Design a protein around this ligand. Structure first.
Ligand SMILES: CC(C)(C)O[C@H](C(=O)O)c1c(-c2ccc3c(c2)CCCO3)nc(-c2cnn(Cc3ccccc3)c2)c2ccccc12
Ligand SMILES: CC(C)(C)O[C@H](C(=O)O)c1c(-c2ccc3c(c2)CCCO3)nc(-c2cnn(Cc3ccccc3)c2)c2ccccc12
Lengths: 132, 132
C-alpha cells in the first residue's frame, strides 16, 4: 500500500500484552510489551512511533482500541488519521534465550526486521526515502 | 560520519533518567525515560535500537555506561562494536503541554526529528538507504 500507513494491534502472551505496529507497505515491525491494554499505553506508543516514522494513517483489527480520548488526543497532536503469528513464531523459538518476555520480543523484532530480496528493515527506508 | 554509528547517553530531569540515542550522521534522535540508570536498561534499549536501525558501533560520553555484562551481552548478540541540550531545550518549552515527563520527551523527539534543507528524520532514511 502507500508509505505512511501503519497497523496497530495487541497480542497476549504469558499474561502480558505485546503492542505490535506493522508498516503495511514494508512488513517492518516495531513492538513493545506493555503492562496493561489501556488507551494511555496506546497513546504514548503512538507518540513514540510518530516521532520516528512519518505516520499518516493507522489501522487496527480492533477498532475499539482507538476510541479513548487519550488516543484521539495523541493522533490529533501528531497529525494522524484513522505477520503477527510469524512474530509469535519467532518469540516462541527464542523464548528460552531470555529471562523476560520483553527481551524475547525485541530479539524477535530484530530477527524479523533483518531477515531477507531485501529485509523489512531495508524496504521501509527505501520506501520512505523514495517518497521524499 | 559513517551510517551505522550511534551515540548513547543519559541525562537527568525531574529525578528521572532520559536515555538519548543520536544517529551521528543525521542528528536523528530516539529516546526513552527509564526508571534507573542501570546496565539492564541500557541493554534492553540497545536491543530495541538494533532491531530498528542497522547499528554497527555505539559511542558514549560516559564509557563506564558500557561495562556491564548485560550491556556487553546485548552488543554481542546484536553484532554491535564500541544536541542533547537542544533536546532539553524542546522538552522545557513543551513540558506544560503534558502531565508526564515521558510524554514531553516524545513530543520533543517528534519536534526535533521533523524540524527542517531536510529534517533529521529525512536524512537518516536517505543516508541508510543510500548505504544499501
Ligand atoms: C536484556 C535484559 C537486561 C532486559 O534482560 C535480559 C533477559 O531478559 O534475559 C538479561 C540478560 C540479557 C542481555 C542481553 C541479551 C539477552 C539477555 C538475550 C539475547 C540478546 O541480548 N542478561 C542477563 C545477564 C547477567 N549476566 N549475564 C552473562 C552473559 C551472557 C551473555 C553474553 C555475555 C555474558 C547475562 C540478565 C540477568 C538477569 C535478568 C535479565 C538478564
Ligand atoms: C500520553 C500519556 C497517556 C502517557 O499521558 C499524557 C500526558 O502525560 O500528558 C496524557 C494525555 C495526553 C495524550 C496525548 C498527548 C498529550 C497528552 C500531549 C501532546 C501529545 O499527545 N491526555 C490525557 C487526557 C485525558 N483526557 N484528555 C482530553 C483531550 C486532550 C487533548 C485533545 C483531545 C482531548 C486528555 C491524560 C490524562 C491523565 C494522565 C495523562 C494524560
Amino acid at each position: 500500500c502507500s508509505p505512511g500507513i501503519w497497523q496497530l494491534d495487541c497480542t497476549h502472551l504469558e499474561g502480558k500484552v505485546i503492542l505490535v505496529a506493522v508498516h503495511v507497505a514494508s512488513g517492518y515491525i516495531e513492538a513493545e510489551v506493555i503492562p496493561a491494554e489501556t488507551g494511555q499505553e496506546t497513546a504514548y506508543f503512538l507518540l513514540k512511533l510518530a516521532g520516528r516514522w512519518p505516520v499518516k494513517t493507522v489501522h487496527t483489527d480492533n477498532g475499539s482500541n482507538f476510541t479513548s480520548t487519550t488516543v484521539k488526543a495523541a493522533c490529533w497532536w501528531a497529525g494522524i488519521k484513522q505477520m503477527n503469528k510469524e512474530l509469535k513464531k519467532i518469540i516462541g523459538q527464542v523464548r528460552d534465550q531470555a529471562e523476560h518476555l520483553k527481551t524475547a520480543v525485541q530479539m524477535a523484532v530484530f530477527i524479523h526486521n533483518h531477515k531477507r530480496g531485501y529485509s523489512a528493515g531495508e524496504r521501509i527506508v527505501d520506501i520512505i526515502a523514495t517518497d521524499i
